[PDB]
Ligand binder design. Structure first.
Ligand SMILES: N[C@@H](CCC(=O)N[C@@H](CS)C(=O)NCC(=O)O)C(=O)O
Ligand SMILES: N[C@@H](CCC(=O)N[C@@H](CS)C(=O)NCC(=O)O)C(=O)O
Lengths: 207, 207
């Protein structure tokens, strides 16, 4: 199973943690975006969208981190606890995965990427979207130890990658008590946490 | 099955078409965002994120359109053709669903929403992101009649909602030959197309 990635990338880290949780060995292939390695014909043949993470598993090329997470659980999970069979349980997880992409990580990208990638001054209105997203996550976690069910799921793992990126970016997570509680627990229970944190510190080099 | 929605909303329309495709009757409940009906305590108790679409199915409150689509197929589908059992088939569909959210519809929102909702002048750099997203979709559709498998899936239905919103916004879809071919076919085969198009024309009132 080939895995095209960089350690600093949040969506890559979500896959790293998920693979560790299911116990599937990845052939980790660094793909140097700053050198344009993802833009060369050899990579475009695998993933025409030229994004990381990309998985190539026995002929199957797959991208979108959250799709990769679910596929790894379905194929390699000795049990389905990270992504249970029940459609209702799956639906809550799926909702959280879309929240992670379209609300929470999107707010990260919209606020920090113009600063670190375009050298633009911080946009205080974009900052308010981060606050709104954390407020929602805080509500989702009211009375809950995990984000999308009774136990750790791929939704938690995706959210850990995102929230740890916020942590290294110096966002004050402590303001959101349920998020902080969930997050500090997640560090202790989530497979691959240490590797995720190493990657967050690599990402930090952009600040 | 309660369905909180507005006809003009693209993510709502994806659910409308999916429900028609699986043959599940929805109790359609208009939720007037301009009146703040989604912000009142009675709705926040159902969906604290105060978004449409929201489904309430026998006690289960669910939001995120693409999560709702999959849940409706899993629960009500007499067959699984719209979201097959095979994890590999599911993974491609899931990838496309994330593409629809995070690449294609995101490019719609980033370009048109500031214009129609904030009265800002058009941003030509944001326009280039739409072009990039259509280019990718055009490549995905090379040699393919459907977006994510041999037959119509929930990925096609989500993409139809998005691309029809582009159509009513006067984006020139014809420039992307595979997209245009796929889209014109999708109109003829996708359950609920007419209702989707009515909603696109309602959305058009914002232009
Ligand atoms: N929605 C994606 C995002 C992937 C993504 O944007 N990756 C970035 C790096 S963090 C990338 O490959 N950028 C290079 C490019 O798009 O050309 C996922 O969850 O996998
Ligand atoms: N990612 C979502 C987006 C839902 C969404 O943003 N809906 C808009 C209307 S098109 C909304 O409810 N806005 C009101 C709000 O967020 O307060 C989904 O696919 O369902």
């Amino acid at each position: 199973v080939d895995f095209y990635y960089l350690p600093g990338s949040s969506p890559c880290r979500s896959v790293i943690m998920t693979a560790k949780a299911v116990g599937v060995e990845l052939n980790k292939k660094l793909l140097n975006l700053q050198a344009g390695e993802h833009l060369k014909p050899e990579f475009l043949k695998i993933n025409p969208q030229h994004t990381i993470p990309t998985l190539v598993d026995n002929g199957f090329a797959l991208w979108e981190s959250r799709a990769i997470q679910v596929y790894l659980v379905e194929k390699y999970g000795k049990t389905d606890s990270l992504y249970p069979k029940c459609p209702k349980k799956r639906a809550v997880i799926n909702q959280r995965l879309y929240f992670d992409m379209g609300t929470l990580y999107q707010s990260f990208a919209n606020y920090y990427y113009p600063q670190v990638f375009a050298k633009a001054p911080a946009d205080p209105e974009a900052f308010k979207k981060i606050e709104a997203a954390f407020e929602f996550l805080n509500t989702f976690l009211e009375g809950q130890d995990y984000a999308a069910g009774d136990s750790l799921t791929v939704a938690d793992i995706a959210l850990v990658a995102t929230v740890s990126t916020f942590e290294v970016a110096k966002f004050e997570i402590s303001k959101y008590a349920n998020v902080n509680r969930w997050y500090e627990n997640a560090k202790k229970v989530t497979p691959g946490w240490e590797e995720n944190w190493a990657g967050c510190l690599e990402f930090k080099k952009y600040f």
